[PDB]
Amino acid sequence: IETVPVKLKPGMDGPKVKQWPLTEEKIKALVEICTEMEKEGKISKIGPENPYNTPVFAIKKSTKWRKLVDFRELNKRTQDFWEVQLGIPHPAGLKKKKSVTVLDVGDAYFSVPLDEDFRKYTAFTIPSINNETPGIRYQYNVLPQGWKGSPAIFQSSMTKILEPFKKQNPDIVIYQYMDDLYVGSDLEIGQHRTKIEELRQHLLRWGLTTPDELHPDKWTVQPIVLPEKDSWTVNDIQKLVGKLNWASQIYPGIKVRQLSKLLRGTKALTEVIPLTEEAELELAENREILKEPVHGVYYDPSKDLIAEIQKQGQGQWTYQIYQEPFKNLKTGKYARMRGAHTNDVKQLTEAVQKITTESIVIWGKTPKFKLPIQKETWETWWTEYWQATWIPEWEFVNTPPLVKLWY
Amino acid sequence: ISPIETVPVKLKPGMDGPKVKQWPLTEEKIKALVEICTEMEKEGKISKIGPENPYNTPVFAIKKKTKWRKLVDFRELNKRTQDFWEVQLGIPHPAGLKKKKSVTVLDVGDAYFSVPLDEDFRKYTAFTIPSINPGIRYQYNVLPQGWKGSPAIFQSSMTKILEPFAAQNPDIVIYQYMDDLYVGSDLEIGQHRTKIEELRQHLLRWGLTTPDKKHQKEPPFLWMGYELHPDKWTVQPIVLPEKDSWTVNDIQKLVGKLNWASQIYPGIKVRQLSKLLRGTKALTEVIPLTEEAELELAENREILKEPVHGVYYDPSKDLIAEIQKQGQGQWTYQIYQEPFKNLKTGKYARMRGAHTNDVKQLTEAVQKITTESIVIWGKTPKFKLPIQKETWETWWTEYWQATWIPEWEFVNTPPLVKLWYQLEKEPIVGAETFYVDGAANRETKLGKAGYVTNKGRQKVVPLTNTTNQKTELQAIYLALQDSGLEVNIVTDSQYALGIIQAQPDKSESELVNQIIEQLIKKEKVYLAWVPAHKGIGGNEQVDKLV
Ligand SMILES: N#Cc1cc2c(Oc3ccccc3OCCC(=O)NCC(F)F)cccn2c1
């Protein structure tokens, strides 16, 4: 197999990212994993004249250890010229299918040799404990998983293998982000799960192994809910006027002038106020403008996506994906169900993973998260529930919400 | 001098080798220089060159701390050479070593000149000895001193040279570090002293001198500002100077020695001393000392009066860390496997953020400790913590951030960690309702604070030297002073609602501290927010008054 030559955007040097300190147990797994990989030829040890680095993590895919490499920085310095040169185009029909299964085709890439001159930028380090020894240094010889260039370069083979199945099933959508195939149908869950096993077998009998379901039918911007109460108070009309005043930044056709006169004198907080004719009229007129979606909100394929998450309590977290302030392209709420075997970081981690998949299905790119968590805390435990092969970008919003209940 | 395989080296892309002009220097040294070039050329570490593709680098000389020495300034070649992997930034921490009966410290001499230089790269190390007028034209064949590539290449060479000797002796353990090797073994002193002799004979077959046992160092070991003792470790003797005036420089060098000692001497406090350093001015001004700073330093002198020690690590024993409060936003921890001997100690201070509370600082301390245990021992400890389950369950349920709390057991040692108050989450029935507001003028900086209550009560207080921020908390403080043990405050300012709902128990502002004192006294407080200037009923009045 001849090698596809690979070039960074000119004036860009290779990545040099610090390796994160690891548990002894995790270091053992990497050294085991990497010893097998050196034998099968996939990676090789390197010298001190290779200055680049890329972090390595150890996750659990299971009772066996998978290795995960954080190619985020090397993706920015090469693939940004490989969304253009060898880019994989995104079908806007996939979000509209009733069911969507996700298949892991990451093994394919490991057969294909990597351009000899590019290998130096795949360098990574297995760290040692207590700086006992400079770590073990490796670089790749095959198409590495998690690099965004592996599926660009393997596209032609993948298009060829898939096409006999695309012919038999012209109504199935197959999309490839990184190391994963998204297959979306309109079949009944029974027939969808059949077709998927057909594709799994077609794939397996062409030499492509995969380990052995979403429904983007209720994926829209969830509407703002005004609490419906049988009786009201001074406090409840203050909470109501405060919410509607904030919504006026989103739906500018909201009038609160009628509800605010309804508590005219300085009155005790718990004092019960019945509402006038013009009050319920301002309440119901505002309920109809708040169940109908926004005007002017369009995906921009040049700006980044941004996902903000807020903690709600009792295993509930709500999220908002936008590109400009207040023009929310998508909103939702995620709830776990892991009893008392669920903790705050398990729940936030699954939230991030679920948000990133919805983002991939809808737009073919992942957001950058504004995460509510101490930075060092996240840099320590995120890998304990990370089941995915990609890694989104994130920063840490140490500023609190103060809003919360408004979502 | 070594048969080591060279490491290929390039120049930074689209650059070329250093072409500098040698300055005329005093002949007293020029002849002192050739007594080095010939005695180096005879050992092969350089070689004379002709006029072919000559770049040049300057060269100097100076006396000795008896034998004049040579200097080559590679500051220009260094700029043009490729980049290399970075040599070990950190070092092992003695808390983390595991005792090995016999330990031997070998320092290889001539280390960079024992290692050869990649052939096609030698021509860019060319340098020239002058005359009065021709000139001697040399170049290097080994890793030149103070070249950018020398440390990382030498480290890798040495590592490769050890590799066959380790594969024969899996019994013994070698730590590498700069030009030193530290060899430890659970071998009886005769087997150990024989193995060390095998090693030195191995290294000399690759061209690497090592000291003879007449020169082998002996414990205690003074390494990287430590005292390494056969069963215990500690820092070097600390010396705190006694000066009348104190330079901004002088304060830096003291908070230095003090932080260093906190690894092992428990109790060191460094808050007030670096509060003085918050001047951030340049480094000769004589900063005056405060009384609290003068007290803290006194207390540190009383810890440092006696000497204290640390044990080494034992992988068969559990890892336990303990945390105790010191009140001033200052926390302290000891890490031990045995209750009379610590592995190490240390402190944590929340010098980030203007308002905080104790539980959040406790959590941040647990976090510092977990990062550090991973670095040093490859695991996390079991925590002995001065706080109770019902306290912590309550805070991390009601917190906005996600938090991760390891298994911990409650050690009942005062001062404990508690929640000193909690805001009500729904308005209090049968409590007055204060509609506070406040306002100030950005130029005059006069402003005012007042409230209006549902019971017809009304106050207004004038302020001087304030801000819309100060006077908005001043309104709330006013409603607290003037009310029952249960009170319903209603405010229009997001800033003031932000501080309070964070539920701090300590702050920089005395205003916020006074508000905290009032909230601890109250028996129930409900705080509530309404949009400012939205004619809601209640605020409108205050705004007028204020
Ligand atoms: N000058 C100097 C010097 C010596 C060492 C050092 O010693 C060791 C060398 C090999 C294996 C284990 C070692 O320590 C185990 C605990 C122990 O007992 N150490 C020696 C003390 F008891 F003397 C380790 C790290 C840096 N060093 C710097």
PDB file of all heavy atoms in Angstrom, chain B residues 92 97-101 103-105 173-175 180 182-185 217 219 221-223 228-232 312, ligand 1, unseen atoms left out:
ATOM      1  N   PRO B  92      12.236  13.359  41.313  1.00  0.00           N
ATOM      2  CA  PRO B  92      11.446  12.511  42.209  1.00  0.00           C
ATOM      3  C   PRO B  92      11.376  13.110  43.608  1.00  0.00           C
ATOM      4  O   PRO B  92      12.295  13.781  44.077  1.00  0.00           O
ATOM      5  CB  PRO B  92      12.184  11.161  42.184  1.00  0.00           C
ATOM      6  CG  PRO B  92      13.525  11.409  41.585  1.00  0.00           C
ATOM      7  CD  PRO B  92      13.516  12.740  40.910  1.00  0.00           C
ATOM      8  N   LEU B  97      10.363   7.745  47.213  1.00  0.00           N
ATOM      9  CA  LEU B  97      11.317   6.647  47.174  1.00  0.00           C
ATOM     10  C   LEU B  97      10.919   5.519  48.137  1.00  0.00           C
ATOM     11  O   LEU B  97      10.137   5.696  49.076  1.00  0.00           O
ATOM     12  CB  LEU B  97      12.706   7.174  47.495  1.00  0.00           C
ATOM     13  CG  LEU B  97      13.019   8.428  46.674  1.00  0.00           C
ATOM     14  CD1 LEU B  97      14.402   9.001  46.996  1.00  0.00           C
ATOM     15  CD2 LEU B  97      12.943   8.112  45.200  1.00  0.00           C
ATOM     16  N   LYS B  98      11.405   4.312  47.850  1.00  0.00           N
ATOM     17  CA  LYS B  98      11.257   3.189  48.771  1.00  0.00           C
ATOM     18  C   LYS B  98      12.656   2.746  49.138  1.00  0.00           C
ATOM     19  O   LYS B  98      13.500   2.580  48.252  1.00  0.00           O
ATOM     20  CB  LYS B  98      10.447   2.025  48.182  1.00  0.00           C
ATOM     21  N   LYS B  99      12.893   2.592  50.445  1.00  0.00           N
ATOM     22  CA  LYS B  99      14.227   2.322  50.959  1.00  0.00           C
ATOM     23  C   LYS B  99      14.797   1.039  50.361  1.00  0.00           C
ATOM     24  O   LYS B  99      14.073   0.071  50.096  1.00  0.00           O
ATOM     25  CB  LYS B  99      14.182   2.225  52.485  1.00  0.00           C
ATOM     26  CG  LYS B  99      15.557   2.095  53.174  1.00  0.00           C
ATOM     27  CD  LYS B  99      15.491   1.135  54.367  1.00  0.00           C
ATOM     28  CE  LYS B  99      14.099   1.098  55.030  1.00  0.00           C
ATOM     29  NZ  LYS B  99      14.155   0.531  56.419  1.00  0.00           N
ATOM     30  N   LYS B 100      16.101   1.062  50.103  1.00  0.00           N
ATOM     31  CA  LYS B 100      16.812  -0.009  49.406  1.00  0.00           C
ATOM     32  C   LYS B 100      18.151  -0.340  50.102  1.00  0.00           C
ATOM     33  O   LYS B 100      19.205  -0.434  49.467  1.00  0.00           O
ATOM     34  CB  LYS B 100      17.016   0.338  47.938  1.00  0.00           C
ATOM     35  CG  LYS B 100      15.749   0.216  47.097  1.00  0.00           C
ATOM     36  CD  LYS B 100      15.267  -1.216  46.989  1.00  0.00           C
ATOM     37  CE  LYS B 100      16.113  -1.976  45.967  1.00  0.00           C
ATOM     38  NZ  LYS B 100      15.931  -3.476  46.013  1.00  0.00           N
ATOM     39  N   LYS B 101      18.091  -0.546  51.418  1.00  0.00           N
ATOM     40  CA  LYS B 101      19.305  -0.950  52.173  1.00  0.00           C
ATOM     41  C   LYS B 101      20.529  -0.170  51.700  1.00  0.00           C
ATOM     42  O   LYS B 101      20.814   0.886  52.285  1.00  0.00           O
ATOM     43  CB  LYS B 101      19.557  -2.445  51.982  1.00  0.00           C
ATOM     44  CG  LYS B 101      18.578  -3.365  52.696  1.00  0.00           C
ATOM     45  CD  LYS B 101      18.876  -4.829  52.474  1.00  0.00           C
ATOM     46  CE  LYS B 101      18.680  -5.667  53.721  1.00  0.00           C
ATOM     47  NZ  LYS B 101      17.364  -5.410  54.351  1.00  0.00           N
ATOM     48  N   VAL B 103      22.699   2.067  49.011  1.00  0.00           N
ATOM     49  CA  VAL B 103      22.495   3.007  47.906  1.00  0.00           C
ATOM     50  C   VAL B 103      23.826   3.661  47.552  1.00  0.00           C
ATOM     51  O   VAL B 103      24.567   4.085  48.444  1.00  0.00           O
ATOM     52  CB  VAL B 103      21.450   4.099  48.263  1.00  0.00           C
ATOM     53  CG1 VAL B 103      21.478   5.210  47.232  1.00  0.00           C
ATOM     54  CG2 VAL B 103      20.044   3.512  48.422  1.00  0.00           C
ATOM     55  N   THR B 104      24.117   3.788  46.258  1.00  0.00           N
ATOM     56  CA  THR B 104      25.432   4.246  45.809  1.00  0.00           C
ATOM     57  C   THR B 104      25.286   5.346  44.764  1.00  0.00           C
ATOM     58  O   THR B 104      24.490   5.215  43.837  1.00  0.00           O
ATOM     59  CB  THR B 104      26.258   3.065  45.214  1.00  0.00           C
ATOM     60  OG1 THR B 104      26.519   2.086  46.239  1.00  0.00           O
ATOM     61  CG2 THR B 104      27.568   3.550  44.635  1.00  0.00           C
ATOM     62  N   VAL B 105      26.081   6.406  44.880  1.00  0.00           N
ATOM     63  CA  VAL B 105      25.929   7.596  44.056  1.00  0.00           C
ATOM     64  C   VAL B 105      27.167   7.755  43.196  1.00  0.00           C
ATOM     65  O   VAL B 105      28.254   8.059  43.706  1.00  0.00           O
ATOM     66  CB  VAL B 105      25.684   8.853  44.898  1.00  0.00           C
ATOM     67  CG1 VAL B 105      25.796  10.105  44.025  1.00  0.00           C
ATOM     68  CG2 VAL B 105      24.322   8.757  45.585  1.00  0.00           C
ATOM     69  N   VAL B 173      18.346  -1.311  41.051  1.00  0.00           N
ATOM     70  CA  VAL B 173      17.577  -0.210  40.492  1.00  0.00           C
ATOM     71  C   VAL B 173      18.444   1.038  40.372  1.00  0.00           C
ATOM     72  O   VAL B 173      19.101   1.447  41.335  1.00  0.00           O
ATOM     73  CB  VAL B 173      16.298   0.068  41.307  1.00  0.00           C
ATOM     74  CG1 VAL B 173      16.207  -0.819  42.498  1.00  0.00           C
ATOM     75  CG2 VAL B 173      16.187   1.510  41.666  1.00  0.00           C
ATOM     76  N   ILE B 174      18.438   1.626  39.175  1.00  0.00           N
ATOM     77  CA  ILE B 174      19.238   2.794  38.832  1.00  0.00           C
ATOM     78  C   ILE B 174      18.304   3.957  38.521  1.00  0.00           C
ATOM     79  O   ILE B 174      17.458   3.852  37.627  1.00  0.00           O
ATOM     80  CB  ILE B 174      20.127   2.507  37.625  1.00  0.00           C
ATOM     81  CG1 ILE B 174      20.950   1.262  37.894  1.00  0.00           C
ATOM     82  CG2 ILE B 174      20.981   3.717  37.295  1.00  0.00           C
ATOM     83  CD1 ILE B 174      21.537   0.668  36.637  1.00  0.00           C
ATOM     84  N   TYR B 175      18.450   5.053  39.259  1.00  0.00           N
ATOM     85  CA  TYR B 175      17.825   6.321  38.925  1.00  0.00           C
ATOM     86  C   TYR B 175      18.844   7.124  38.140  1.00  0.00           C
ATOM     87  O   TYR B 175      19.998   7.240  38.565  1.00  0.00           O
ATOM     88  CB  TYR B 175      17.401   7.093  40.175  1.00  0.00           C
ATOM     89  CG  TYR B 175      16.162   6.565  40.845  1.00  0.00           C
ATOM     90  CD1 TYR B 175      16.066   5.235  41.212  1.00  0.00           C
ATOM     91  CD2 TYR B 175      15.091   7.392  41.130  1.00  0.00           C
ATOM     92  CE1 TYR B 175      14.928   4.743  41.838  1.00  0.00           C
ATOM     93  CE2 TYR B 175      13.938   6.902  41.757  1.00  0.00           C
ATOM     94  CZ  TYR B 175      13.869   5.573  42.106  1.00  0.00           C
ATOM     95  OH  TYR B 175      12.755   5.053  42.721  1.00  0.00           O
ATOM     96  N   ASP B 180      24.559  12.187  36.999  1.00  0.00           N
ATOM     97  CA  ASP B 180      24.680  11.333  38.163  1.00  0.00           C
ATOM     98  C   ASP B 180      23.908  10.052  37.891  1.00  0.00           C
ATOM     99  O   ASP B 180      23.018  10.012  37.043  1.00  0.00           O
ATOM    100  CB  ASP B 180      24.156  12.053  39.442  1.00  0.00           C
ATOM    101  CG  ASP B 180      25.157  13.089  40.050  1.00  0.00           C
ATOM    102  OD1 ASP B 180      25.825  13.868  39.322  1.00  0.00           O
ATOM    103  OD2 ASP B 180      25.237  13.159  41.290  1.00  0.00           O
ATOM    104  N   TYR B 182      22.245   6.920  40.546  1.00  0.00           N
ATOM    105  CA  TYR B 182      22.024   6.517  41.924  1.00  0.00           C
ATOM    106  C   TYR B 182      21.549   5.082  41.886  1.00  0.00           C
ATOM    107  O   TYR B 182      20.500   4.795  41.310  1.00  0.00           O
ATOM    108  CB  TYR B 182      21.007   7.428  42.630  1.00  0.00           C
ATOM    109  CG  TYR B 182      21.227   8.910  42.355  1.00  0.00           C
ATOM    110  CD1 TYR B 182      20.160   9.757  42.052  1.00  0.00           C
ATOM    111  CD2 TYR B 182      22.506   9.457  42.376  1.00  0.00           C
ATOM    112  CE1 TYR B 182      20.370  11.110  41.795  1.00  0.00           C
ATOM    113  CE2 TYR B 182      22.717  10.799  42.114  1.00  0.00           C
ATOM    114  CZ  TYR B 182      21.655  11.625  41.826  1.00  0.00           C
ATOM    115  OH  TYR B 182      21.893  12.959  41.565  1.00  0.00           O
ATOM    116  N   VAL B 183      22.330   4.181  42.482  1.00  0.00           N
ATOM    117  CA  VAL B 183      22.129   2.741  42.363  1.00  0.00           C
ATOM    118  C   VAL B 183      21.737   2.191  43.724  1.00  0.00           C
ATOM    119  O   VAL B 183      22.478   2.355  44.700  1.00  0.00           O
ATOM    120  CB  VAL B 183      23.386   2.027  41.836  1.00  0.00           C
ATOM    121  CG1 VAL B 183      22.989   0.696  41.234  1.00  0.00           C
ATOM    122  CG2 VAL B 183      24.157   2.912  40.819  1.00  0.00           C
ATOM    123  N   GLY B 184      20.589   1.525  43.784  1.00  0.00           N
ATOM    124  CA  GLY B 184      20.079   0.997  45.034  1.00  0.00           C
ATOM    125  C   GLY B 184      19.747  -0.473  44.892  1.00  0.00           C
ATOM    126  O   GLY B 184      19.387  -0.945  43.824  1.00  0.00           O
ATOM    127  N   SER B 185      19.908  -1.206  45.987  1.00  0.00           N
ATOM    128  CA  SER B 185      19.812  -2.660  45.917  1.00  0.00           C
ATOM    129  C   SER B 185      19.506  -3.254  47.285  1.00  0.00           C
ATOM    130  O   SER B 185      20.058  -2.813  48.295  1.00  0.00           O
ATOM    131  CB  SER B 185      21.108  -3.264  45.397  1.00  0.00           C
ATOM    132  OG  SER B 185      20.943  -4.654  45.232  1.00  0.00           O
ATOM    133  N   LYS B 217      30.568   8.776  47.266  1.00  0.00           N
ATOM    134  CA  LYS B 217      29.992   9.564  48.351  1.00  0.00           C
ATOM    135  C   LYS B 217      29.316   8.648  49.379  1.00  0.00           C
ATOM    136  O   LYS B 217      29.113   7.454  49.152  1.00  0.00           O
ATOM    137  CB  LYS B 217      29.003  10.589  47.801  1.00  0.00           C
ATOM    138  N   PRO B 219      26.361   8.560  52.932  1.00  0.00           N
ATOM    139  CA  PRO B 219      25.246   9.266  53.563  1.00  0.00           C
ATOM    140  C   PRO B 219      25.730  10.080  54.752  1.00  0.00           C
ATOM    141  O   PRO B 219      26.738   9.733  55.388  1.00  0.00           O
ATOM    142  CB  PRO B 219      24.310   8.131  54.002  1.00  0.00           C
ATOM    143  CG  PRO B 219      24.768   6.919  53.247  1.00  0.00           C
ATOM    144  CD  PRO B 219      26.218   7.098  53.001  1.00  0.00           C
ATOM    145  N   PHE B 221      23.032  12.382  52.223  1.00  0.00           N
ATOM    146  CA  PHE B 221      23.163  12.882  50.859  1.00  0.00           C
ATOM    147  C   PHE B 221      22.494  14.248  50.757  1.00  0.00           C
ATOM    148  O   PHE B 221      21.322  14.410  51.127  1.00  0.00           O
ATOM    149  CB  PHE B 221      22.546  11.916  49.847  1.00  0.00           C
ATOM    150  CG  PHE B 221      23.353  10.662  49.611  1.00  0.00           C
ATOM    151  CD1 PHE B 221      22.800   9.403  49.854  1.00  0.00           C
ATOM    152  CD2 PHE B 221      24.649  10.743  49.113  1.00  0.00           C
ATOM    153  CE1 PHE B 221      23.539   8.259  49.631  1.00  0.00           C
ATOM    154  CE2 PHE B 221      25.392   9.605  48.889  1.00  0.00           C
ATOM    155  CZ  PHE B 221      24.840   8.362  49.152  1.00  0.00           C
ATOM    156  N   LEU B 222      23.247  15.220  50.263  1.00  0.00           N
ATOM    157  CA  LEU B 222      22.779  16.582  50.063  1.00  0.00           C
ATOM    158  C   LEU B 222      22.428  16.708  48.594  1.00  0.00           C
ATOM    159  O   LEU B 222      23.283  17.024  47.761  1.00  0.00           O
ATOM    160  CB  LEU B 222      23.840  17.589  50.472  1.00  0.00           C
ATOM    161  CG  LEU B 222      24.215  17.670  51.956  1.00  0.00           C
ATOM    162  CD1 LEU B 222      24.699  19.080  52.235  1.00  0.00           C
ATOM    163  CD2 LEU B 222      23.060  17.266  52.901  1.00  0.00           C
ATOM    164  N   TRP B 223      21.166  16.445  48.267  1.00  0.00           N
ATOM    165  CA  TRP B 223      20.734  16.380  46.877  1.00  0.00           C
ATOM    166  C   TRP B 223      19.533  17.287  46.680  1.00  0.00           C
ATOM    167  O   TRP B 223      18.513  17.127  47.360  1.00  0.00           O
ATOM    168  CB  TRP B 223      20.397  14.941  46.481  1.00  0.00           C
ATOM    169  CG  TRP B 223      19.749  14.830  45.132  1.00  0.00           C
ATOM    170  CD1 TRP B 223      20.325  15.067  43.904  1.00  0.00           C
ATOM    171  CD2 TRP B 223      18.397  14.461  44.876  1.00  0.00           C
ATOM    172  NE1 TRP B 223      19.408  14.853  42.914  1.00  0.00           N
ATOM    173  CE2 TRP B 223      18.214  14.485  43.487  1.00  0.00           C
ATOM    174  CE3 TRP B 223      17.317  14.118  45.694  1.00  0.00           C
ATOM    175  CZ2 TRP B 223      16.997  14.168  42.903  1.00  0.00           C
ATOM    176  CZ3 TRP B 223      16.116  13.806  45.108  1.00  0.00           C
ATOM    177  CH2 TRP B 223      15.965  13.825  43.732  1.00  0.00           C
ATOM    178  N   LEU B 228      19.171  13.315  52.426  1.00  0.00           N
ATOM    179  CA  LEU B 228      18.778  11.935  52.196  1.00  0.00           C
ATOM    180  C   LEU B 228      19.556  11.077  53.173  1.00  0.00           C
ATOM    181  O   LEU B 228      20.780  10.956  53.066  1.00  0.00           O
ATOM    182  CB  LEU B 228      19.026  11.521  50.750  1.00  0.00           C
ATOM    183  CG  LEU B 228      18.111  12.261  49.765  1.00  0.00           C
ATOM    184  CD1 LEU B 228      18.532  12.025  48.309  1.00  0.00           C
ATOM    185  CD2 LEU B 228      16.643  11.876  50.014  1.00  0.00           C
ATOM    186  N   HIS B 229      18.850  10.530  54.154  1.00  0.00           N
ATOM    187  CA  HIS B 229      19.360   9.685  55.222  1.00  0.00           C
ATOM    188  C   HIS B 229      18.882   8.263  55.018  1.00  0.00           C
ATOM    189  O   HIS B 229      17.744   8.046  54.592  1.00  0.00           O
ATOM    190  CB  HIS B 229      18.900  10.143  56.617  1.00  0.00           C
ATOM    191  CG  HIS B 229      19.473  11.450  57.065  1.00  0.00           C
ATOM    192  ND1 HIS B 229      19.495  11.824  58.388  1.00  0.00           N
ATOM    193  CD2 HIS B 229      20.039  12.467  56.375  1.00  0.00           C
ATOM    194  CE1 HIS B 229      20.061  13.014  58.495  1.00  0.00           C
ATOM    195  NE2 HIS B 229      20.397  13.428  57.287  1.00  0.00           N
ATOM    196  N   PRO B 230      19.703   7.305  55.346  1.00  0.00           N
ATOM    197  CA  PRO B 230      19.347   5.889  55.170  1.00  0.00           C
ATOM    198  C   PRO B 230      17.968   5.443  55.664  1.00  0.00           C
ATOM    199  O   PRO B 230      17.447   4.434  55.166  1.00  0.00           O
ATOM    200  CB  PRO B 230      20.467   5.191  55.940  1.00  0.00           C
ATOM    201  CG  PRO B 230      21.674   6.091  55.641  1.00  0.00           C
ATOM    202  CD  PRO B 230      21.144   7.499  55.577  1.00  0.00           C
ATOM    203  N   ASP B 231      17.334   6.165  56.586  1.00  0.00           N
ATOM    204  CA  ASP B 231      15.975   5.813  56.949  1.00  0.00           C
ATOM    205  C   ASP B 231      15.005   6.974  57.002  1.00  0.00           C
ATOM    206  O   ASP B 231      13.839   6.774  57.378  1.00  0.00           O
ATOM    207  CB  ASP B 231      15.957   5.085  58.283  1.00  0.00           C
ATOM    208  CG  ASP B 231      15.891   3.626  58.076  1.00  0.00           C
ATOM    209  OD1 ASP B 231      15.274   3.276  57.040  1.00  0.00           O
ATOM    210  OD2 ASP B 231      16.472   2.845  58.877  1.00  0.00           O
ATOM    211  N   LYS B 232      15.437   8.165  56.610  1.00  0.00           N
ATOM    212  CA  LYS B 232      14.641   9.361  56.810  1.00  0.00           C
ATOM    213  C   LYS B 232      15.125  10.420  55.826  1.00  0.00           C
ATOM    214  O   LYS B 232      16.272  10.387  55.374  1.00  0.00           O
ATOM    215  CB  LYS B 232      14.744   9.838  58.268  1.00  0.00           C
ATOM    216  CG  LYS B 232      16.153  10.238  58.738  1.00  0.00           C
ATOM    217  CD  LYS B 232      16.139  10.717  60.167  1.00  0.00           C
ATOM    218  CE  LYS B 232      17.552  10.833  60.724  1.00  0.00           C
ATOM    219  NZ  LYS B 232      17.611  11.457  62.091  1.00  0.00           N
ATOM    220  N   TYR B 312      10.043   7.140  54.301  1.00  0.00           N
ATOM    221  CA  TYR B 312       9.937   6.744  52.908  1.00  0.00           C
ATOM    222  C   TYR B 312       8.664   5.925  52.712  1.00  0.00           C
ATOM    223  O   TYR B 312       7.908   5.649  53.663  1.00  0.00           O
ATOM    224  CB  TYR B 312      11.170   5.952  52.492  1.00  0.00           C
ATOM    225  CG  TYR B 312      12.459   6.742  52.421  1.00  0.00           C
ATOM    226  CD1 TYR B 312      13.631   6.232  52.953  1.00  0.00           C
ATOM    227  CD2 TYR B 312      12.512   7.992  51.804  1.00  0.00           C
ATOM    228  CE1 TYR B 312      14.838   6.944  52.879  1.00  0.00           C
ATOM    229  CE2 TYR B 312      13.725   8.709  51.714  1.00  0.00           C
ATOM    230  CZ  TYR B 312      14.888   8.173  52.260  1.00  0.00           C
ATOM    231  OH  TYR B 312      16.086   8.866  52.193  1.00  0.00           O
TER     232      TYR B 312
HETATM  233  N1  LIG C   1      23.050  12.021  46.237  1.00  0.00           N
HETATM  234  C1  LIG C   1      22.119  11.395  46.018  1.00  0.00           C
HETATM  235  C2  LIG C   1      20.851  10.578  45.699  1.00  0.00           C
HETATM  236  C3  LIG C   1      20.491   9.220  46.039  1.00  0.00           C
HETATM  237  C4  LIG C   1      19.217   8.996  45.501  1.00  0.00           C
HETATM  238  C5  LIG C   1      18.301   7.941  45.441  1.00  0.00           C
HETATM  239  O1  LIG C   1      18.582   6.749  46.064  1.00  0.00           O
HETATM  240  C6  LIG C   1      18.082   5.585  45.471  1.00  0.00           C
HETATM  241  C7  LIG C   1      18.743   5.079  44.352  1.00  0.00           C
HETATM  242  C8  LIG C   1      18.288   3.896  43.790  1.00  0.00           C
HETATM  243  C9  LIG C   1      17.192   3.231  44.348  1.00  0.00           C
HETATM  244  C10 LIG C   1      16.543   3.721  45.467  1.00  0.00           C
HETATM  245  C11 LIG C   1      17.003   4.898  46.033  1.00  0.00           C
HETATM  246  O2  LIG C   1      16.359   5.421  47.146  1.00  0.00           O
HETATM  247  C12 LIG C   1      15.523   4.566  47.903  1.00  0.00           C
HETATM  248  C13 LIG C   1      15.257   5.102  49.346  1.00  0.00           C
HETATM  249  C14 LIG C   1      16.602   5.229  50.070  1.00  0.00           C
HETATM  250  O3  LIG C   1      16.863   4.579  51.027  1.00  0.00           O
HETATM  251  N2  LIG C   1      17.505   6.210  49.484  1.00  0.00           N
HETATM  252  C15 LIG C   1      18.872   6.550  49.828  1.00  0.00           C
HETATM  253  C16 LIG C   1      19.109   7.141  51.179  1.00  0.00           C
HETATM  254  F1  LIG C   1      18.775   6.126  52.056  1.00  0.00           F
HETATM  255  F2  LIG C   1      20.451   7.460  51.038  1.00  0.00           F
HETATM  256  C17 LIG C   1      17.098   8.078  44.815  1.00  0.00           C
HETATM  257  C18 LIG C   1      16.786   9.250  44.220  1.00  0.00           C
HETATM  258  C19 LIG C   1      17.707  10.282  44.275  1.00  0.00           C
HETATM  259  N3  LIG C   1      18.891  10.125  44.913  1.00  0.00           N
HETATM  260  C20 LIG C   1      19.757  11.071  44.973  1.00  0.00           C
END
